[PDB]
Design a protein around this nucleic acid. Structure first.
Ligand SMILES: [Zn+2]
Lengths: 221, 25, 83, 129, 132, 217, 71, 101
RNA sequence: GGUUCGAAGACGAUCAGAUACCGUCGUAGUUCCGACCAUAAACGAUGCCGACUGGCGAUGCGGCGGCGUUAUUCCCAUGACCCGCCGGGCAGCUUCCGGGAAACCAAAGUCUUUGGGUUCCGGGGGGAGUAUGGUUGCAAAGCUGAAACUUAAAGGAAUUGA
RNA sequence: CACAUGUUCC
């Protein structure tokens, strides 16, 4: 039941020392533990399964069939993730996709449309992401519009925290594996696009592993 | 049927229509 | 990012590349966080503070990651300006 | 041959910006390009430029910052009314918070905000953000 | 085929690295040495492990073995790694220096020194492998 | 390191660079190594600039000193020349030594018992240790490399231009780094020379170990 | 479009006019032969006279007898 | 799909090369497309090289060799095992096999 | 004019049959001149002009510079080599530039962050490059070029079995 | 020197 950490990044998570997951993204450190997400956002986070894909391969004694899972995950304010796992059994693949989905959560950037009053609601600019031949574009939208999209990427924008956005999908969107990943790249590039507000010199704070380099050696390996 | 010989069959058939139409005039 | 009434609204500010001036993404696992030790002028010993930099993973894979730090190193005085 | 001159200059510095060059050289120097470069500099999108005026079409060395995403050109120069100028920036600029459409007017060459201030239209030149 | 499997081989690896003084050379003694110090469920494997040990014995007195941890052979290697000769290989009064590298030091601060002897460069550039 | 007479070039280190042939480069030239080379002599060997080598040697020495924990500085050598030089450098400084056969997955696989989390990667040769540079991409790792003129710069982050082909020029450059990382932190005074003699770090061939023994007998 | 001239409107319009005839839906709706071959002639419904009842055999795997009328 | 970048020939800027016949069959193969083998061999190899030597009137007479430039087609060379199929990564290697015997 | 080869054809083998593959002949043709013919897997299956975007070693030509070896011999200069630089000429190697469905591409990049210029051309697969009409050609055939009707797939790249 | 061909469903 009790969590014992493996990666030394997660050691500081258990020592009550990492204040938030934002400075984890600040230094682009890799996350390889699914329960690191569970310490910061273990309550508001929700999961939702996209599709169960029964892929198979041709063997000599019939077709070896295994089940591929598609789970999108993320709390409704600031974060969203996607995970794909292809296991032997459906429930194992669903459970195994949740673990990979928490490892792949990314922070969102929410912007205003025109006027800048209240809370940010829409995508700050026109970002797009693609994999394979599926290309998905995100357009800023006024308040109260809703998510104008296909039903499957509509769940992802519910779970990313964006309430209003216009979308456009180019390509064979019947393939849900590429259709979901192409959208998930587009939200993931919101903090990859340079904004004119972000033209200031970024002050460098102390590294999270640097600030507790003595704390990480006095109690364990 | 190879695509080459069906073209050759068409030319033999087209030439056959050439002689048949010519004798009527 | 600002609202109308003058409050910061983003949950964090991402880093920026020291050479290419691009913002470093959250999943740029090939990012660099350099730490450059300073030297005391008379005793020639370590002081205690940092002169840290930040380089995106694209520059490493393009082969100018040693040159990028080197160019800031002349400008920050770590490397002798004659070189 | 070289039909448009501004198109070759803007794409040359866009290729350098994608690679992230500190400064870039464009082979022709024109009055339109010099006016084009002054529009972007007042907004701080690029580093400071200089021209090398020989006895031919001169060469311009433009210092670059990392603040440029894409500087495109619209060919041919369609005339833009004041009524559909909002329609031009809707499907060309990324957002309404930033992004600049520059277009030549009788008062001079300026971005779309300053053309709204002077209430003057004209022919489009390009887009940059 | 009398090829020793991994279960026989891996069991014989741990015995040597723990009982170097207890092990002998002939088959029958270390057969009985391994009888007390190893819980082997059958006599057949007891002969097979001790027999493979004896084949590894002939590799031991003839030099080192890759996959082994002997406390006596590492002590031989440890002092050989920490060998210090009475002078350095850098201390020669004779240093041959290319004339093109003599122009190097002269533009630097440390141009003219005491024990630097300039040679004569080879005339005629011939350094590339023939094409083909 | 920048125009500071305490850290400028020493005359004792000049004769060491020349006798070990560290200024001697390779036959070919990587286009990133065009800035560390004086001029290519006749017979087609490039000449590495030693003062600029010394300047790059000082900048990498700032890296280990800035790392507060000396343990998590992974030092890896795969070619047979460099294991003896990197083992005592890790012993003297406190770094983590890896001697040959870099296991793929020491920085990515959690289940491995050799799962290391360094803050710094020091590489004897980029071509001999390209595999440590591969996991230097998957984990945020600044990298130091002892590069030659032929050595490419894929995923290296700071380079010290040296001769990594000659055995005397390999272990001397680590004997450079063993002195300097202990010279900003307080272990060694710069007035007196450091007492360990550089043949300790040099690779001994098994023939040379066999060659030495009868003269001792 | 390929050509982007400021006075190529007659070139662009002629290309779109010609390439529309290569579309299956446009050529069907803008030719007299498609309406000539249609027994309804654009009519949604029509009245006819029954002269016999015809049984039609079915296609591949699904096999049955479909009841039809020659109208 | 495209199997070979050069389409199994050395024609890059010509567009047309002269054909040559084969050794086993009379197949018309382009000169750059043909597998060309040049064999340096003696008239007699192991057994007849010895007994003729003492039977030669002139002592210490070197036996002349025979020079044949072989020209095989794709079907002929593979059937005669001059060349063989390789993997997709092994195709791109064009260095000759090592020559020691 | 017809040496060789060789459609058609004859003959001998093989096979259940060969009217094919094999072998012996062999007309037209293959060879030269003067006129037609305008079709090829006429391919880089990749229109043409202009710019930018990594290197690496070659190679063809011309030019430039330089230690040196070697010929005319009597050396300068010209030849043959060696070391580099320049322009494009055919290419190759290499990598997370970048792109593409992938194979792969220094162009097939600089594209949802979509606009340098200008032609040709395609709209599921058959019918069908067919009928008819027009036009050229001595002929063979060449160019333009449908519809009725039928069909829920055809096809491209790639993985695993057989 | 020959090894030509074996209706439809999972
Ligand atoms: Zn053949």
């Amino acid at each position: 039941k009790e969590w014992l950490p493996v990666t030394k990044l997660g050691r500081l998570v258990k020592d009550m020392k990492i204040k938030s997951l934002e400075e984890i993204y600040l230094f682009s450190l890799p996350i390889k533990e699914s329960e690191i997400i569970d310490f910061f956002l273990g309550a508001s986070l929700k999961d939702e399964v996209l599709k169960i894909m029964p892929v198979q391969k041709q063997t000599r004694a019939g077709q070896r069939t295994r089940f591929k899972a598609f789970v999108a995950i993320g709390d409704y304010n600031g974060h969203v993730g996607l995970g794909v796992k292809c296991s032997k059994e459906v429930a194992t693949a669903i459970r195994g996709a949740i673990i990979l989905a928490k490892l792949s959560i990314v922070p969102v950037r929410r912007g205003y449309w025109g006027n800048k009053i209240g809370k940010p609601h829409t995508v700050p600019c026109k970002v797009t992401g693609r994999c394979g031949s599926v290309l998905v574009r995100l357009i800023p939208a006024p308040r109260g519009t809703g998510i104008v999209s296909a039903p499957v990427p509509k769940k992802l924008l519910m779970m990313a925290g964006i309430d209003d956005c216009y979308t456009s999908a180019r390509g064979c969107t019947a393939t849900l594996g590429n259709f979901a990943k192409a959208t998930f790249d587009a939200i993931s590039k919101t903090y990859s696009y340079l904004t004119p507000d972000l033209w200031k010199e970024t002050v460098f704070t102390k590294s999270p592993y640097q600030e507790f380099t003595d704390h990480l050696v006095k109690t364990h390996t | 049927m190879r695509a080459k010989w069906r073209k050759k069959r068409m030319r033999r058939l087209k030439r056959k229509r050439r002689k048949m139409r010519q004798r009527s005039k | 990012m600002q609202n109308d009434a003058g409050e910061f609204v983003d949950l964090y500010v991402p880093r920026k590349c020291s050479a290419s001036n691009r913002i470093i993404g959250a999943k740029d696992h090939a990012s660099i966080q350099m730490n450059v030790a300073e030297v005391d002028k008379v005793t020639g010993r370590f002081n205690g503070q940092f002169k840290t930099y930040a380089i995106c993973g694209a520059i490493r894979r393009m082969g100018e990651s040693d040159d990028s730090i080197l160019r800031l190193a002349k400008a920050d005085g770590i490397v002798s300006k004659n070189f | 041959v070289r039909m448009n001159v501004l198109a070759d200059a803007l794409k040359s510095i866009n290729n350098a910006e994608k690679r992230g060059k500190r400064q870039v050289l464009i082979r022709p120097c024109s009055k339109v390009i010099v006016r084009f470069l002054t529009v972007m500099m007042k907004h701080g999108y690029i580093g400071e430029f200089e021209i090398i005026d020989d006895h031919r079409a001169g060469k311009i060395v433009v210092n670059l910052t990392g603040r440029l995403n894409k500087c495109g050109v619209i060919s041919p120069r369609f005339d833009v009314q004041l009524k559909d100028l909002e329609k031009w920036q809707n499907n060309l600029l990324p957002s309404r918070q930033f992004g600049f459409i520059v277009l030549t007017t009788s008062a001079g060459i300026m971005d779309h905000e300053e053309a709204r201030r002077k209430h003057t239209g004209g022919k489009i030149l390009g887009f940059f953000f | 085929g009398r090829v020793r499997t991994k279960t026989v081989k891996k069991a014989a690896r741990v015995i040597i690295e723990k009982y170097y003084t207890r092990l002998g050379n002939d088959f029958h003694t270390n057969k009985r040495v391994c009888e007390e110090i190893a819980i082997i469920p059958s006599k057949k494997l007891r002969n097979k492990i001790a027999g493979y040990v004896t084949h590894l014995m002939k590799r031991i007195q003839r030099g080192p073995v890759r996959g082994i941890s002997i406390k006596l052979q590492e002590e031989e290697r440890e002092r050989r790694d920490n060998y210090v000769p009475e002078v350095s290989a850098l201390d020669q009064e004779i240093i041959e220096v290319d004339p093109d590298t003599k122009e190097m030091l002269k533009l630097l601060d440390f141009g003219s020194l005491s024990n630097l002897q300039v040679t004569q460069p080879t005339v005629g550039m011939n350094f590339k492998t023939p094409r083909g | 390191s920048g125009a500071l007479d305490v850290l400028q070039m020493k005359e004792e280190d000049v004769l060491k660079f020349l006798a070990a042939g560290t200024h001697l480069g390779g036959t070919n030239l990587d286009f990133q190594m065009e800035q560390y080379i004086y001029k290519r002599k006749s017979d087609g060997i490039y000449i590495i600039n030693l003062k600029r080598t010394w300047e790059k040697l000082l900048l990498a020495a700032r890296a280990i000193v800035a790392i507060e924990n000396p343990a998590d500085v992974s030092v890896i050598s795969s070619r047979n020349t460099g294991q003896r030089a990197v083992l005592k450098f890790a012993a003297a400084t406190g770094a983590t030594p890896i001697a040959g056969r870099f296991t793929p997955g020491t920085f990515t696989n959690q289940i491995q018992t050799a799962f290391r989390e360094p803050r710094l990667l020091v590489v004897t040769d980029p071509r001999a240790d390209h595999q440590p540079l591969t996991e230097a991409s998957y984990v945020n790792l600044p990298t130091i490399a002892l590069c030659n003129t032929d050595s490419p710069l894929r995923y290296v982050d700071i380079a010290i231009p040296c001769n990594n082909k000659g055995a005397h020029s390999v272990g001397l450059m680590w004997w450079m780094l063993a002195r300097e990382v202990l010279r900003m932190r307080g272990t060694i005074s710069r007035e007196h020379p450091w007492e360990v003699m550089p043949d300790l770090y040099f690779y001994r061939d098994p023939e040379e170990i066999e060659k030495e023994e009868q003269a001792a007998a | 479009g390929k050509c982007r001239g400021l006075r190529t409107a007659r070139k662009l319009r002629s290309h779109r006019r010609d390439q529309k005839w290569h579309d299956k839906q446009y050529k069907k709706a803008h030719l007299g032969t498609a309406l000539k071959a249609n027994p309804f002639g654009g009519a949604s419904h029509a009245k006819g006279i029954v002269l016999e009842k015809v049984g039609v055999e079915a296609k591949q795997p699904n096999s049955a007898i479909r009841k039809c009328v020659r109208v | 799909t495209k199997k070979r970048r050069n389409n199994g020939r050395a024609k890059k800027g010509r567009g047309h090369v002269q054909p040559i016949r084969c050794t086993n069959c009379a197949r018309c193969v382009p000169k750059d497309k043909a597998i060309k083998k040049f064999v340096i061999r003696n008239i007699v190899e192991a057994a007849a090289v010895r007994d003729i030597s003492e039977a030669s009137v002139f002592d210490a007479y070197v036996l002349p060799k025979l020079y044949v430039k072989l020209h095989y087609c794709v079907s002929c060379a593979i059937h005669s095992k001059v060349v063989r199929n390789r993997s997709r990564e092994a195709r791109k290697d064009r260095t000759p096999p090592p020559r020691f015997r």
